[PDB]
Design an enzyme around this catalytic site. Sequence first.
Site, PDB file in Angstrom:
ATOM      1  N   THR A 263      37.015  58.291  37.232  1.00 13.23           N
ATOM      2  CA  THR A 263      35.834  57.504  37.565  1.00 13.23           C
ATOM      3  C   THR A 263      35.177  58.008  38.841  1.00 13.23           C
ATOM      4  O   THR A 263      33.955  58.205  38.884  1.00 13.23           O
ATOM      5  CB  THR A 263      36.218  56.032  37.713  1.00 13.23           C
ATOM      6  OG1 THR A 263      37.348  55.926  38.588  1.00 13.23           O
ATOM      7  CG2 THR A 263      36.587  55.435  36.368  1.00 13.23           C
ATOM      8  N   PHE A 388      32.216  47.979  38.912  1.00 15.74           N
ATOM      9  CA  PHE A 388      33.642  47.802  39.285  1.00 15.74           C
ATOM     10  C   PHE A 388      34.246  46.568  38.608  1.00 15.74           C
ATOM     11  O   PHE A 388      35.218  46.027  39.129  1.00 15.74           O
ATOM     12  CB  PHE A 388      33.786  47.726  40.803  1.00 15.74           C
ATOM     13  CG  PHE A 388      33.395  48.999  41.501  1.00 15.74           C
ATOM     14  CD1 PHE A 388      34.206  50.115  41.438  1.00 15.74           C
ATOM     15  CD2 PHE A 388      32.199  49.088  42.191  1.00 15.74           C
ATOM     16  CE1 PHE A 388      33.840  51.288  42.072  1.00 15.74           C
ATOM     17  CE2 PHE A 388      31.834  50.265  42.820  1.00 15.74           C
ATOM     18  CZ  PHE A 388      32.658  51.360  42.765  1.00 15.74           C
ATOM     19  N   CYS A 395      37.796  45.986  40.029  1.00 22.00           N
ATOM     20  CA  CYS A 395      38.421  47.189  40.565  1.00 22.00           C
ATOM     21  C   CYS A 395      39.039  46.967  41.939  1.00 22.00           C
ATOM     22  O   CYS A 395      38.316  46.757  42.920  1.00 22.00           O
ATOM     23  CB  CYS A 395      37.373  48.299  40.659  1.00 22.00           C
ATOM     24  SG  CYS A 395      38.059  49.779  41.392  1.00 22.00           S
TER      25      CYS A 395
HETATM   26  C1  HEM Z   1      33.700  55.015  41.028  1.00 27.31           C
HETATM   27  C2  HEM Z   1      35.012  54.761  40.912  1.00 27.31           C
HETATM   28  C3  HEM Z   1      35.599  53.616  40.047  1.00 27.31           C
HETATM   29  C4  HEM Z   1      35.039  52.864  39.081  1.00 27.31           C
HETATM   30  C5  HEM Z   1      33.609  52.927  38.500  1.00 27.31           C
HETATM   31  C6  HEM Z   1      36.040  51.925  38.614  1.00 27.31           C
HETATM   32  C7  HEM Z   1      35.870  50.983  37.627  1.00 27.31           C
HETATM   33  C8  HEM Z   1      36.746  49.960  37.331  1.00 27.31           C
HETATM   34  C9  HEM Z   1      36.456  48.856  36.447  1.00 27.31           C
HETATM   35  C10 HEM Z   1      35.118  48.639  35.703  1.00 27.31           C
HETATM   36  C11 HEM Z   1      37.537  48.074  36.404  1.00 27.31           C
HETATM   37  C12 HEM Z   1      37.686  46.787  35.568  1.00 27.31           C
HETATM   38  C13 HEM Z   1      38.363  47.215  34.267  1.00 27.31           C
HETATM   39  C14 HEM Z   1      38.481  46.073  33.294  1.00 27.31           C
HETATM   40  O1  HEM Z   1      37.917  44.976  33.557  1.00 27.31           O
HETATM   41  O2  HEM Z   1      39.151  46.269  32.249  1.00 27.31           O
HETATM   42  C15 HEM Z   1      38.560  48.666  37.247  1.00 27.31           C
HETATM   43  C16 HEM Z   1      39.826  48.175  37.484  1.00 27.31           C
HETATM   44  C17 HEM Z   1      40.783  48.774  38.283  1.00 27.31           C
HETATM   45  N1  HEM Z   1      40.614  49.899  39.066  1.00 27.31           N
HETATM   46 FE1  HEM Z   1      38.857  50.981  39.298  1.00 27.31          FE
HETATM   47  N2  HEM Z   1      37.194  52.137  39.333  1.00 27.31           N
HETATM   48  C18 HEM Z   1      36.965  53.155  40.226  1.00 27.31           C
HETATM   49  C19 HEM Z   1      37.858  53.676  41.129  1.00 27.31           C
HETATM   50  C20 HEM Z   1      39.160  53.264  41.309  1.00 27.31           C
HETATM   51  C21 HEM Z   1      40.092  53.790  42.272  1.00 27.31           C
HETATM   52  C22 HEM Z   1      39.808  54.918  43.283  1.00 27.31           C
HETATM   53  C23 HEM Z   1      41.253  53.146  42.133  1.00 27.31           C
HETATM   54  C24 HEM Z   1      42.478  53.478  43.023  1.00 27.31           C
HETATM   55  C25 HEM Z   1      43.716  53.123  42.688  1.00 27.31           C
HETATM   56  C26 HEM Z   1      41.091  52.157  41.063  1.00 27.31           C
HETATM   57  C27 HEM Z   1      42.022  51.256  40.566  1.00 27.31           C
HETATM   58  C28 HEM Z   1      41.802  50.195  39.699  1.00 27.31           C
HETATM   59  C29 HEM Z   1      42.765  49.185  39.284  1.00 27.31           C
HETATM   60  C30 HEM Z   1      44.246  49.117  39.736  1.00 27.31           C
HETATM   61  C31 HEM Z   1      42.157  48.341  38.434  1.00 27.31           C
HETATM   62  C32 HEM Z   1      42.780  47.098  37.752  1.00 27.31           C
HETATM   63  C33 HEM Z   1      42.647  45.947  38.760  1.00 27.31           C
HETATM   64  C34 HEM Z   1      43.180  44.625  38.261  1.00 27.31           C
HETATM   65  O3  HEM Z   1      42.848  44.225  37.117  1.00 27.31           O
HETATM   66  O4  HEM Z   1      43.924  43.957  39.025  1.00 27.31           O
HETATM   67  N3  HEM Z   1      39.794  52.278  40.591  1.00 27.31           N
HETATM   68  N4  HEM Z   1      38.037  49.820  37.801  1.00 27.31           N
END
Ligand code: HEM
Length: 451
Positions: A263, A388, A395
């Site tokens: 991402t 996010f 996120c």
């Molecule tokens: C531009 C960069 C990023 C974008 C666009 C992005 C996007 C997203 C989105 C849309 C979700 C929600 C997913 C869902 O609802 O099923 C998510 C969840 C998550 N992201 Fe990111 N992400 C990015 C970067 C990162 C980074 C750098 C990390 C570092 C570890 C990360 C870790 C996570 C985690 C652990 C979740 C699950 C959180 C939870 O449900 O407790 N992401 N991300």
Amino acid sequence: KKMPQPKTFGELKNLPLLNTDKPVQALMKIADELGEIFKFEAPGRVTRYLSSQRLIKEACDESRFDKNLSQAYKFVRDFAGDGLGTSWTHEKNWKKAHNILLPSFSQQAMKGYHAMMVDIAVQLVQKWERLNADEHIEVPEDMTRLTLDTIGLCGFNYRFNSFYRDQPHPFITSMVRALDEAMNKLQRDDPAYDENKRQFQEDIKVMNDLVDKIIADRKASGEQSDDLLTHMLNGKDPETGEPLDDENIRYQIITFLIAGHETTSGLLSFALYFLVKNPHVLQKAAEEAARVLVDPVPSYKQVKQLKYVGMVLNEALRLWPTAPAFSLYAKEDTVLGGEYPLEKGDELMVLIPQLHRDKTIWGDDVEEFRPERFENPSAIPQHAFKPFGNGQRACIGQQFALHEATLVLGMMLKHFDFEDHTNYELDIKETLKLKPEGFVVKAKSKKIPLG
Ligand code: HEM
């Protein structure tokens, strides 16, 4: 009101519509012709795709809808386990990890990761400084090298050393191959899938073997670093009073790498693409970087003063959110938008690129790259910009990704002029995330010392 539905294939219903290279882009074109909501049926499966802010604001109501695990992320769960991204909200280990990990991901906690982010960003800049006159840059390829290395360093103090190689680290190789197999199973008991069910296990092993050793190594050493692993080995959930066990810590580290690398790499790649296609916006961003990044090495505070660079990144996320969809289910019977009754358990998909093209929120020029749309972020209505995700299932890495991308794009704009030497035509490759495939530029050094 009766819900629109795209074309059907007999007993396969709509499922063959996603048997394609670019399913999200196909889903966007369907939303264009059918509107803010459409039903998508498959053998034994039903989901509703949402594209309007008017409906997505209700879907983001956490009292009415919770995160659903899509079919793809159920397959990812075979190696991501009950890490944050592939666990249900009601699973004990989700809330535990959420409470333990949120402090490690604060805007303020970025101060501790900044030095190691600068470490990898300097390697990127130096690589480009060292290219010869005739040579060009493979943009997503180098952004992926940067983001994977940055997560490995800040995550568990591990150096993948991606800028020292062509074939990635065996872990990275096997992770992406495992993600690929998880994706491929979307369109598939039968004994023909016997070799696919044997290679999957080998990739899970290497990922598990190396991270478990790292965690064992750190427990034995007792050393304290500025990484997420240290915080996870010593954190206690305030609610249960329990720490994460080693197996779940392993799943968390695997999850950081799955969730963050593609991402953030896609974001940097789309951001540079829109900059080279909009030279007036590039110049304005380069003038900011030169004005603000007055030291050989960027400081944490300097990165926070890169306002326009942040607007550039948010506008890139508006047009091409690199995790382009998330899934929800109805907690109880409810009516959506005053006209669509839903039963408890009914699934929704938020089609984020279409939300971000809602002309009632952004105006008629939604396809244009205009960073000035984010001059005042408070003017944007609730649930209108969701790159996010939403709510407590948003996120956790948002501040990490935006700090890394602002730092790296800031340094890129300080140190190089860029040429779209092939007049690249945008081609968006889709895995579970989006990226501009084949995007390529030249970069001429401004010859500024760097250190
Ligand atoms: C531009 C960069 C990023 C974008 C666009 C992005 C996007 C997203 C989105 C849309 C979700 C929600 C997913 C869902 O609802 O099923 C998510 C969840 C998550 N992201 Fe990111 N992400 C990015 C970067 C990162 C980074 C750098 C990390 C570092 C570890 C990360 C870790 C996570 C985690 C652990 C979740 C699950 C959180 C939870 O449900 O407790 N992401 N991300």
